[PDB]
Scaffold this motif. Structure first.
Motif, PDB file in Angstrom:
ATOM      1  N   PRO A 110     -11.517  23.056   1.799  1.00 32.67           N
ATOM      2  CA  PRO A 110     -11.937  21.662   1.971  1.00 32.67           C
ATOM      3  C   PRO A 110     -10.770  20.703   1.805  1.00 32.67           C
ATOM      4  O   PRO A 110      -9.842  20.945   1.031  1.00 32.67           O
ATOM      5  N   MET A 111     -10.826  19.604   2.551  1.00 36.57           N
ATOM      6  CA  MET A 111      -9.791  18.588   2.446  1.00 36.57           C
ATOM      7  C   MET A 111      -9.890  17.874   1.105  1.00 36.57           C
ATOM      8  O   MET A 111     -10.982  17.660   0.575  1.00 36.57           O
ATOM      9  N   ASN A 112      -8.736  17.507   0.556  1.00 40.01           N
ATOM     10  CA  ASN A 112      -8.680  16.887  -0.755  1.00 40.01           C
ATOM     11  C   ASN A 112      -8.378  15.405  -0.627  1.00 40.01           C
ATOM     12  O   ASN A 112      -7.478  15.027   0.136  1.00 40.01           O
ATOM     13  N   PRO A 113      -9.106  14.545  -1.335  1.00 39.14           N
ATOM     14  CA  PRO A 113      -8.780  13.115  -1.316  1.00 39.14           C
ATOM     15  C   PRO A 113      -7.379  12.868  -1.855  1.00 39.14           C
ATOM     16  O   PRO A 113      -6.879  13.612  -2.700  1.00 39.14           O
ATOM     17  N   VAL A 114      -6.742  11.813  -1.340  1.00 44.04           N
ATOM     18  CA  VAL A 114      -5.376  11.497  -1.737  1.00 44.04           C
ATOM     19  C   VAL A 114      -5.326  11.220  -3.230  1.00 44.04           C
ATOM     20  O   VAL A 114      -6.121  10.438  -3.765  1.00 44.04           O
ATOM     21  N   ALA A 115      -4.382  11.865  -3.913  1.00 45.14           N
ATOM     22  CA  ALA A 115      -4.250  11.755  -5.357  1.00 45.14           C
ATOM     23  C   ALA A 115      -2.848  11.274  -5.698  1.00 45.14           C
ATOM     24  O   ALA A 115      -1.923  11.365  -4.888  1.00 45.14           O
ATOM     25  N   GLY A 116      -2.702  10.760  -6.918  1.00 47.10           N
ATOM     26  CA  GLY A 116      -1.441  10.182  -7.335  1.00 47.10           C
ATOM     27  C   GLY A 116      -1.013   8.983  -6.527  1.00 47.10           C
ATOM     28  O   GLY A 116       0.186   8.807  -6.285  1.00 47.10           O
ATOM     29  N   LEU A 117      -1.957   8.150  -6.099  1.00 46.74           N
ATOM     30  CA  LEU A 117      -1.677   7.039  -5.201  1.00 46.74           C
ATOM     31  C   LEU A 117      -1.530   5.750  -5.998  1.00 46.74           C
ATOM     32  O   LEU A 117      -2.456   5.342  -6.707  1.00 46.74           O
TER      33      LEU A 117
ATOM     34  N   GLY B  87      10.767  -3.915  -6.142  1.00 46.96           N
ATOM     35  CA  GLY B  87      11.247  -5.223  -6.544  1.00 46.96           C
ATOM     36  C   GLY B  87      10.133  -6.006  -7.209  1.00 46.96           C
ATOM     37  O   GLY B  87       9.374  -5.464  -8.015  1.00 46.96           O
ATOM     38  N   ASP B  88      10.053  -7.285  -6.862  1.00 48.80           N
ATOM     39  CA  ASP B  88       8.962  -8.110  -7.355  1.00 48.80           C
ATOM     40  C   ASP B  88       7.642  -7.646  -6.740  1.00 48.80           C
ATOM     41  O   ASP B  88       7.610  -7.238  -5.572  1.00 48.80           O
ATOM     42  N   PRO B  89       6.544  -7.678  -7.494  1.00 53.58           N
ATOM     43  CA  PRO B  89       5.242  -7.329  -6.909  1.00 53.58           C
ATOM     44  C   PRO B  89       4.859  -8.310  -5.812  1.00 53.58           C
ATOM     45  O   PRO B  89       4.767  -9.519  -6.040  1.00 53.58           O
ATOM     46  N   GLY B  90       4.636  -7.778  -4.611  1.00 52.09           N
ATOM     47  CA  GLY B  90       4.308  -8.587  -3.459  1.00 52.09           C
ATOM     48  C   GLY B  90       5.495  -9.043  -2.640  1.00 52.09           C
ATOM     49  O   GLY B  90       5.302  -9.536  -1.521  1.00 52.09           O
ATOM     50  N   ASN B  91       6.714  -8.897  -3.158  1.00 47.76           N
ATOM     51  CA  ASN B  91       7.928  -9.242  -2.431  1.00 47.76           C
ATOM     52  C   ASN B  91       8.778  -8.019  -2.117  1.00 47.76           C
ATOM     53  O   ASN B  91       9.978  -8.159  -1.856  1.00 47.76           O
ATOM     54  N   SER B  92       8.187  -6.826  -2.136  1.00 47.71           N
ATOM     55  CA  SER B  92       8.932  -5.590  -1.958  1.00 47.71           C
ATOM     56  C   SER B  92       8.042  -4.545  -1.300  1.00 47.71           C
ATOM     57  O   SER B  92       6.821  -4.697  -1.220  1.00 47.71           O
ATOM     58  N   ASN B  93       8.679  -3.478  -0.825  1.00 53.29           N
ATOM     59  CA  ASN B  93       7.956  -2.401  -0.164  1.00 53.29           C
ATOM     60  C   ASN B  93       7.124  -1.613  -1.167  1.00 53.29           C
ATOM     61  O   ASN B  93       7.425  -1.581  -2.364  1.00 53.29           O
ATOM     62  N   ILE B  94       6.067  -0.975  -0.670  1.00 50.08           N
ATOM     63  CA  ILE B  94       5.230  -0.081  -1.460  1.00 50.08           C
ATOM     64  C   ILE B  94       5.255   1.291  -0.805  1.00 50.08           C
ATOM     65  O   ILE B  94       5.394   1.402   0.418  1.00 50.08           O
ATOM     66  N   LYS B  95       5.129   2.336  -1.618  1.00 52.87           N
ATOM     67  CA  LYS B  95       5.204   3.709  -1.139  1.00 52.87           C
ATOM     68  C   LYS B  95       3.882   4.422  -1.373  1.00 52.87           C
ATOM     69  O   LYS B  95       3.314   4.351  -2.467  1.00 52.87           O
ATOM     70  N   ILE B  96       3.399   5.102  -0.337  1.00 56.17           N
ATOM     71  CA  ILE B  96       2.211   5.940  -0.442  1.00 56.17           C
ATOM     72  C   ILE B  96       2.653   7.323  -0.901  1.00 56.17           C
ATOM     73  O   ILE B  96       3.262   8.073  -0.133  1.00 56.17           O
ATOM     74  N   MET B  97       2.349   7.664  -2.151  1.00 53.86           N
ATOM     75  CA  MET B  97       2.748   8.943  -2.724  1.00 53.86           C
ATOM     76  C   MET B  97       1.532   9.826  -2.955  1.00 53.86           C
ATOM     77  O   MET B  97       0.506   9.365  -3.467  1.00 53.86           O
ATOM     78  N   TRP B  98       1.660  11.094  -2.574  1.00 51.48           N
ATOM     79  CA  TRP B  98       0.630  12.097  -2.778  1.00 51.48           C
ATOM     80  C   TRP B  98       1.292  13.463  -2.866  1.00 51.48           C
ATOM     81  O   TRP B  98       2.420  13.658  -2.407  1.00 51.48           O
ATOM     82  N   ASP B  99       0.577  14.411  -3.462  1.00 48.99           N
ATOM     83  CA  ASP B  99       1.047  15.787  -3.500  1.00 48.99           C
ATOM     84  C   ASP B  99       0.693  16.475  -2.188  1.00 48.99           C
ATOM     85  O   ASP B  99      -0.471  16.469  -1.770  1.00 48.99           O
ATOM     86  N   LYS B 100       1.694  17.058  -1.540  1.00 53.72           N
ATOM     87  CA  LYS B 100       1.467  17.696  -0.252  1.00 53.72           C
ATOM     88  C   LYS B 100       0.537  18.893  -0.428  1.00 53.72           C
ATOM     89  O   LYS B 100       0.843  19.800  -1.215  1.00 53.72           O
ATOM     90  N   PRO B 101      -0.592  18.934   0.272  1.00 52.98           N
ATOM     91  CA  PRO B 101      -1.528  20.049   0.094  1.00 52.98           C
ATOM     92  C   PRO B 101      -0.958  21.349   0.637  1.00 52.98           C
ATOM     93  O   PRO B 101      -0.074  21.359   1.499  1.00 52.98           O
ATOM     94  N   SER B 102      -1.476  22.459   0.108  1.00 56.26           N
ATOM     95  CA  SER B 102      -1.044  23.772   0.576  1.00 56.26           C
ATOM     96  C   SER B 102      -1.400  23.979   2.042  1.00 56.26           C
ATOM     97  O   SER B 102      -0.745  24.758   2.744  1.00 56.26           O
ATOM     98  N   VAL B 103      -2.440  23.292   2.522  1.00 55.69           N
ATOM     99  CA  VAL B 103      -2.821  23.411   3.923  1.00 55.69           C
ATOM    100  C   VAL B 103      -1.765  22.749   4.796  1.00 55.69           C
ATOM    101  O   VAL B 103      -1.384  21.591   4.582  1.00 55.69           O
ATOM    102  N   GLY B 104      -1.286  23.490   5.792  1.00 55.27           N
ATOM    103  CA  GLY B 104      -0.223  22.983   6.636  1.00 55.27           C
ATOM    104  C   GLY B 104      -0.722  21.973   7.651  1.00 55.27           C
ATOM    105  O   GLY B 104      -1.917  21.861   7.927  1.00 55.27           O
ATOM    106  N   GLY B 105       0.223  21.228   8.216  1.00 56.59           N
ATOM    107  CA  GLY B 105      -0.098  20.247   9.242  1.00 56.59           C
ATOM    108  C   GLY B 105      -0.988  19.120   8.765  1.00 56.59           C
ATOM    109  O   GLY B 105      -1.920  18.725   9.477  1.00 56.59           O
ATOM    110  N   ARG B 106      -0.724  18.592   7.574  1.00 53.96           N
ATOM    111  CA  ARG B 106      -1.513  17.509   7.003  1.00 53.96           C
ATOM    112  C   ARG B 106      -0.616  16.316   6.709  1.00 53.96           C
ATOM    113  O   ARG B 106       0.419  16.456   6.050  1.00 53.96           O
TER     114      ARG B 106
END
Length: 197
Positions: free
Chosen positions: A1-8, A14-33
């Motif tokens: 089963p697909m896993n909801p994004v975790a560690g997000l 930089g300043d909150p709202g004045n800088s880039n944000i990164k989408i971070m998640w643990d890469k699932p064992s299932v390939g091509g995701r």
């Protein structure tokens, strides 16, 4: 089963709202995701944008999030959708509350001047890899040089200082903005110390 994004969490550079944000998640064992990139408004959880990048951590344009919000992104909640390329099925959208992330405390900066005349500004690496530094001399009280340097130490050449002022500066101030290895950043924290020979 697909896993909801975790560690997000919104990884501010930089300043909150004045800088880039990164989408971070643990890469699932299932390939091509890969995980879709979007961010939710606080009041109604509106969608900002939609793009797919395989990289586990990726920068997101600040202008787009500010335009979609209409104001600075001080408080955000982030939604991410994981997609399987081989099956082609879009997974369940996962919206999670996000808090601002602050980088570790900057190493206490040390200002020293050598016999040659270079004004060497050295702060230990500590738990931060790079820093956003604005350099202002105390004598003129102007930010002559502004640069984000990965180097823990900043050295200004004696020739450049002599060209700029005509003599070496005794007191010089700096502001440093921490950045952790993952790219999290905190509001600029200022250390001030007179240069010591």
């Amino acid at each position: 089963p697909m896993n909801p994004v975790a560690g997000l969490y919104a990884v501010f550079t930089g300043d909150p709202g004045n800088s880039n944000i990164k989408i971070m998640w643990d890469k699932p064992s299932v390939g091509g995701r890969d995980v879709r990139i979007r961010n939710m408004h606080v009041t109604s959880s509106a969608t900002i944008s939609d793009q797919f990048v395989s990289d586990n951590n990726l920068v997101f344009t600040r202008e787009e999030q500010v335009a979609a919000y209409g104001f600075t992104a001080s408080s955000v909640s982030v939604r991410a959708q994981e997609h399987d390329i081989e099956s082609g099925a879009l997974g369940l959208t996962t919206e999670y509350v996000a808090v601002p992330e602050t980088a570790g405390t900057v190493g206490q900066g040390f200002a020293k001047k050598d016999s040659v005349g270079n004004c060497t500004m050295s702060w230990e690496v500590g738990d931060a890899v790079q820093w956003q530094v604005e350099i202002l001399n105390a004598e003129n009280s102007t930010v002559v040089k502004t640069e984000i340097v990965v180097a823990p130490t900043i050295t200004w050449m004696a020739e450049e200082i002599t060209a700029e002022y005509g003599y070496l500066t005794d007191h010089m101030v700096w502001r440093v903005r921490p950045y952790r290895a993952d790219g999290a950043s905190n509001v600029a924290k200022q250390f001030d110390m007179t240069a010591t020979l």
